Design a protein around this nucleic acid. Sequence first.
RNA 1: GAGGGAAACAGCCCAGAUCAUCAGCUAAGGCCCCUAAGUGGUGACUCAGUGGGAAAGGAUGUGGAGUUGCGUAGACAACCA
RNA 2: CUCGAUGUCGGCUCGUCGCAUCCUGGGGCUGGAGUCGGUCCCAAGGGUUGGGCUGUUCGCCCAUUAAAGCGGCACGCGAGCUGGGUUCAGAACGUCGUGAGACAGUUCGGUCCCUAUCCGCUGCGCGCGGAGGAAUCUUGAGAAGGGCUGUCUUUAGUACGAG
RNA 3: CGCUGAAAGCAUCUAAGCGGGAAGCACGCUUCAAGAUAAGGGUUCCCACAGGAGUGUUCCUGGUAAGGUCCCCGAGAGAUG
Lengths: 214, 37, 146, 177, 23
Amino acid sequence: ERTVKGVLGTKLGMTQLWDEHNRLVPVTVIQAGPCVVTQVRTPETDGYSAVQLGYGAVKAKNVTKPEAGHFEKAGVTPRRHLVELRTADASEYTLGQEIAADVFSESDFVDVTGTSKGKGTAGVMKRHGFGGLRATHGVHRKHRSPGSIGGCSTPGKVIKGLRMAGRMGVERVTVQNLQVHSVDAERGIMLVRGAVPGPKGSLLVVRSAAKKAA
Amino acid sequence: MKVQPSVKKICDKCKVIRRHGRVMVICDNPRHKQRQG
Amino acid sequence: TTYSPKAGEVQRKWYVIDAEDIVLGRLATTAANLLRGKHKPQYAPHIDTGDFVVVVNASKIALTGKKATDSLRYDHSGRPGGLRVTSIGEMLAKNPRRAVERAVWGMMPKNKLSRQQLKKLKVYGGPEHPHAAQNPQPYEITQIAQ
Amino acid sequence: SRIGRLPIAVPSGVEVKLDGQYVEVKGPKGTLNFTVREPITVSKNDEGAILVERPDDERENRSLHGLTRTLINNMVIGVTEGYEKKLEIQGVGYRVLSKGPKQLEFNLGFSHPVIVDAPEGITFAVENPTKFSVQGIDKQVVGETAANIRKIRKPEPYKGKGVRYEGENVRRKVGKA
Amino acid sequence: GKTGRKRRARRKKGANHGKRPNA
RNA sequence: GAGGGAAACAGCCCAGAUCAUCAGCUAAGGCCCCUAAGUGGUGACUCAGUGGGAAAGGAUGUGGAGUUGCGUAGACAACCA
RNA sequence: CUCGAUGUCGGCUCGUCGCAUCCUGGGGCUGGAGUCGGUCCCAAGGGUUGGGCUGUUCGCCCAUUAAAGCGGCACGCGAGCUGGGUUCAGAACGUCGUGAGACAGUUCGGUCCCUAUCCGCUGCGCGCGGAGGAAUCUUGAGAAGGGCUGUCUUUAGUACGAG
RNA sequence: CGCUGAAAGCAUCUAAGCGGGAAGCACGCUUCAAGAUAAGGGUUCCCACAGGAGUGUUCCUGGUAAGGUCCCCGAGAGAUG
Ligand SMILES: [Mg+2]
Ligand SMILES: [Mg+2]
Ligand SMILES: [Mg+2]
Ligand SMILES: [Mg+2]
Ligand SMILES: [Mg+2]
Ligand SMILES: [Mg+2]
Ligand SMILES: [Mg+2]
Ligand SMILES: [Mg+2]
Ligand SMILES: [Mg+2]
Ligand SMILES: [Mg+2]
Ligand SMILES: [Mg+2]
Ligand SMILES: [Mg+2]
Ligand SMILES: [Mg+2]
Ligand SMILES: [Mg+2]
Ligand SMILES: [Mg+2]
Ligand SMILES: [Mg+2]
Ligand SMILES: [Mg+2]
Ligand SMILES: [Mg+2]
Ligand SMILES: [Mg+2]
Ligand SMILES: [Mg+2]
Ligand SMILES: [Mg+2]
Ligand SMILES: [Mg+2]
Ligand SMILES: [Mg+2]
Ligand SMILES: [Mg+2]
Ligand SMILES: [Mg+2]
Ligand SMILES: [Mg+2]
Ligand SMILES: [Mg+2]
Ligand SMILES: [Mg+2]
Ligand SMILES: [Mg+2]
Ligand SMILES: [Mg+2]
Ligand SMILES: [Mg+2]
Ligand SMILES: [Mg+2]
Ligand SMILES: [Mg+2]
Ligand SMILES: [Mg+2]
């Protein structure tokens, strides 16, 4: 229902800048490269309004026949990635249209979505901030234990949703209201004030800020 | 408003009504407003 | 030896019921009876001999008293504080199919066969259904005197 | 229903269409419409009046009888004469002004002026910075609009400051005796 | 108690005739 | 002390299992669906989901039956002195 | 009910639920000048501090805070921890007993264990199905998380008030 | 807290109806999600193979297409998968 502008990019890393109030600002560098409209979704044929964007450099021998046919119908060269943008203005998008970082101006607030860095199987003390037990005073082989995990004969069970150890990281995380610092479209570079999820080289979705601003 | 199981006329101007299944006392004087509960 | 149906021996038909201004209880009892095939002399509890029921206009099911806002339906996700509750009026407005299926399932035996048979109930809140190919015949809820 | 059993006299220029359960009332001031509850019927009584009949002498029959009689009489008297309500404001610094027949601006001691829009059938009429009025063709709508205007700043029991009805008997006491 | 009250009130069912073990 | 009823439920209700039966009639309890048999017939009452837990006390809920005061010398409300 | 064993206080850890609401939200009556208050309703979304004393619960106190809620869950939680208290054998004091000894009197000291089978729960795979076999992008029935709050500035020394 | 308004000639937030009204309810925000066996939808690719039995072809073997896995080099991933 909401109209969203969007673009796809790659997390190149971070550096720092100084703003006009001489304030040090951390900036993430996103190679908000050229994206092409591979497919437009309409209520008539698909049931919702969204725009599928491409983006990515792919080797010709690593694109299969179904993907090649999809891109041939789109009328564009094959791209590595394909990500949709749920926008209510999908129609205004034509098949094969060119999208560049200049879709965002010098002070727009954006939401950046990416897959967070993985940590493997994490303990409770790390993946949930559990305070363990003391290091001394008789603590017996339970320094990083989760403590109790329930009650007693009532309910004689462990409630669903209890926080215990497990695999943390590698998940969809959206960080909101990041003010774009600068856009240089002729080389497809975006400087966004903040820290975005994911390791260097990961795919990032930069969309217009859902909550507009602070 | 006073919420009491026992609501009665206090003055001569108070009126007892049944509103939305509850017995209430309405009066020009706001002190006499009552509701069963 | 008493007769017993053989798998596909009993031919299953398609009925359509217009739930227009019909009480939910009567609609659900009729649907359960039809789905289980209790109106057939070939009935057998262990073999599905019932018919398919297509209910239309489920959004206009009649409710008596203050049921539309005081008769509640509960679901629990299985975790603490995982209860949701919604009134039958809201459920008929939003997802009438869920309401009709809940009523019919409650009125139907608690069986694997009953679970299978409940899939034969096709509930649509509007006046139109997509099963013209199956050619459902209209069914009128009636009573037999004395 | 002693109220209901009394007839309703249709005045000149008022068109009363009794299309079964649904009724139209045309007049010089506008148009109103209403549906009577089912166990109550309406007749013309020689086309010069209106009658409402309860089919039984139960409670809901009599109650809806009186209700429908009063409400039909209200719509006809509205379409033949309208509805008027006078609201007066007391307290220093309080003012009301008009940006048109359907737009009011109130300075009721707030931080900023407050804007009041009117519905289509509601028209305001201000004559004094401390007195104004609302008119319409629906008694219920006029009454609720006046109620909202009063709710903006209801009278107080200390210095009366607030929008009050013209005949409102506002209570009052004394704090710092 | 609620449990005791329900246990005592169970004797009012039709098939029982106003009596039930443990009241 | 099985069987039927009581949701489940040694002590309550019905009823005392010799075995077989793919016969019939009943008991308690039941007859919209779960669940076998009535969404039974006729006349009232309830609209609280009361039915399907509870007290002192409280209440212009609603139906019915009285007793009694006043009243077209004109009653009760509403409206002018 | 359990004596062919259902481990008993407080803290730690982890929560979850009730509302008989401590704060924050809304409203009546009072009021109450205002400022504040106090009381009868609503309301459980979130939040509800750190220390001194004592084994303590409780309680008192210090310094804060929007506030430092009350309760249930085997007085939640020892196959999660703690062993300071309690309730073993040592010893001492007081009291009692002729004495062995006794004391919900006091004091110092004082062993526990468990590689998780089943359910439960946090994660992660394999299989098969999804009426041909595939590749990509998805809808969301439904599920979970999140929901706190202060101070200052301004409106304005305005409203109110004799000040 | 109301508006209109009877039953009850008035009145009444209520009996018909309409409006306001909280950090609560449901959304809004974020995340998982078709084992949702109701197993969804769009787009794209591959194609009517071979040999036996057969009993409407059925079904069982065999080589493939699109595509995928094994194996190897790794990390932005990871206990092992
Ligand atoms: Mg630590
Ligand atoms: Mg250690
Ligand atoms: Mg258990
Ligand atoms: Mg008690
Ligand atoms: Mg015997
Ligand atoms: Mg027996
Ligand atoms: Mg029995
Ligand atoms: Mg039984
Ligand atoms: Mg018989
Ligand atoms: Mg009998
Ligand atoms: Mg059963
Ligand atoms: Mg009948
Ligand atoms: Mg009957
Ligand atoms: Mg009740
Ligand atoms: Mg009840
Ligand atoms: Mg009672
Ligand atoms: Mg044992
Ligand atoms: Mg409460
Ligand atoms: Mg809480
Ligand atoms: Mg809740
Ligand atoms: Mg103490
Ligand atoms: Mg607690
Ligand atoms: Mg305990
Ligand atoms: Mg334990
Ligand atoms: Mg010790
Ligand atoms: Mg011990
Ligand atoms: Mg000495
Ligand atoms: Mg001695
Ligand atoms: Mg000791
Ligand atoms: Mg272990
Ligand atoms: Mg959903
Ligand atoms: Mg599920
Ligand atoms: Mg009134
Ligand atoms: Mg009023």
